[PDB]
Homo-oligomer: A and B are copies of this chain.
């Protein structure tokens, strides 16, 4: 099927330039090209008029928790909610994410329901974003992602690699292999105590090396939840692809960031972080857009944009952190740019996003894989 978009301004996100009075030609699910003028439709061609709108690539959030959302009894809910209840909440969470304009997301940690949500979205059963999910986060005994942390002793048990808790290199290798078995796209680990403590490193170098090498064997990237400097630097030298939060980032940690090329996902919205992200941006750290949505109501992801520009980030590069940098961090080459040969993920807002980023908090047109999900 063929669809033509009459775009008043469409962002060449790579060339950093607005294109004026242009047409987008989409065949099936893929953008077939960009043509000059408002091309009148050939027979069988569906046309959407966005001449008064600003047109963007599909926005991507690299830190989301689609299974959950913050709630006045979040700790109690860990003991009474079953997988089906979580799935039914996740349905609404995913749809609101999609209609906020975030057509692609990276689910960084779950109970395994996230894998099912990804499979249900891909089968066409549930309206949602493209999900790349880590499945269960991997942690060490007592780590931040240890599921039975703080439990009564009767219920605490001995979590092992099958459950996402590994100790030592061989158990780490098996835990990575198990996440691969469960259908996870990527691996996520918690290298420091996060949010009985919260900066001491919870991973040895040998364990981090084992995990990075295993993930490289199965073509999965490694994302790291890290607040402490020591664990963050251990992960950075281990060869991980992404560091999340980084609340206490050392100057040595920034030198490691730029030398390794790992991405820093700021996660200011879940929040020191504003200063840390500002200093990181000034220093040249590669930045990818991430909200850690779930702690923050799903559908308000765009808010993060404003505060990143409030920390001194130029609007254009903030959008690149949500688009091109996101696709690079994902390791996918068919997303993050409106160009010939790429996948038809299109966003549209009312006013110019580079003059006021807050217009992205009201995305008026959302199209994923060629289908229009929102058109006002």
Residues of A within 8 A of B (CB): 82-89, 91-92, 112-113, 116-117, 119-120, 125-126, 140-143, 146, 149, 153, 158, 160-162, 167-171, 173-174, 177-178, 180-181, 183, 196-197, 200-202, 204, 213, 217-219
- Asked if A219 and B197 make an inter-chain contact with CB atoms under 8 angstroms apart, the answer reads yes
Taking A83-B83, A84-B112 as given, write out 10 further A-B residue pairs in contact, using a Cβ cutoff of 8 Å, ordered by the A residue number.
Answer: A84-B117, A88-B116, A91-B91, A112-B153, A141-B180, A161-B167, A168-B169, A168-B174, A177-B202, A202-B217
Contacts of A197 in B (CB 8 A): 180, 218-219
- Which of B82, B126, B173, B183 interacts with A204 by CB under 8 Å? B173
Contacts of A143 in B (CB 8 A): 177
In the assembled complex, the CB of A112 is this many whole angstroms from the nearest CB of chain B, namely 7
- Asked if B173 and A125 make an inter-chain contact with CB atoms under 8 angstroms apart, the answer reads no
- Asked if B178 and A141 make an inter-chain contact with CB atoms under 8 angstroms apart, the answer reads yes
Task: Provide 20 A-B residue pairs closer than 8 Å at the C-beta atoms, listed in order of the A residue.
Answer: A84-B87, A87-B87, A87-B88, A88-B91, A88-B116, A88-B120, A140-B174, A140-B177, A141-B178, A142-B180, A146-B181, A167-B170, A168-B173, A173-B204, A180-B196, A183-B196, A197-B218, A200-B218, A202-B217, A202-B218
In the assembled complex, the CB of A338 is this many whole angstroms from the nearest CB of chain B, namely 30
In the assembled complex, the CB of A224 is this many whole angstroms from the nearest CB of chain B, namely 16
Q: In whole angstroms, how far apart are the Cα atoms of A153 and B204 in the complex?
A: 30
Contacts of A181 in B (CB 8 A): 141-142, 146, 149
- Asked if A173 and B167 make an inter-chain contact with CB atoms under 8 angstroms apart, the answer reads yes
Contacts of A196 in B (CB 8 A): 180, 183
Q: Which 7 A/B pairs are nearest by Cβ-Cβ distance?
A: A168-B170, A142-B181, A84-B116, A88-B120, A141-B177, A87-B87, A167-B174
Which residue of chain B lies nearest to A158 when distances are taken between CB atoms in the complex? B162
- Asked if A91 and B177 make an inter-chain contact with CB atoms under 8 angstroms apart, the answer reads no
Contacts of A91 in B (CB 8 A): 88, 91, 125-126
Which residue of chain B lies nearest to A115 when distances are taken between CB atoms in the complex? B84
Which residue of chain B lies nearest to A84 when distances are taken between CB atoms in the complex? B116
Contacts A91-B125, A177-B167 given; indicate if A119 touches B85 (C-beta within 8 A).
yes
- Asked if B117 and A88 make an inter-chain contact with CB atoms under 8 angstroms apart, the answer reads yes
Q: In whole angstroms, how far apart are the Cα atoms of A26 and B40 in the complex?
A: 47
- Which of B86, B141, B161, B219 interacts with A200 by CB under 8 Å? B219
In the assembled complex, the CB of A19 is this many whole angstroms from the nearest CB of chain B, namely 39
In the assembled complex, the CB of A88 is this many whole angstroms from the nearest CB of chain B, namely 4
A92, A119, A160, A177, most chain B CB atoms within 10 A: A177
In the assembled complex, the CB of A209 is this many whole angstroms from the nearest CB of chain B, namely 12
- Asked if B201 and A92 make an inter-chain contact with CB atoms under 8 angstroms apart, the answer reads no
Q: In whole angstroms, how far apart are the Cα atoms of A86 and B119 in the complex?
A: 12
Contacts of A126 in B (CB 8 A): 88, 91
- Asked if B167 and A89 make an inter-chain contact with CB atoms under 8 angstroms apart, the answer reads no
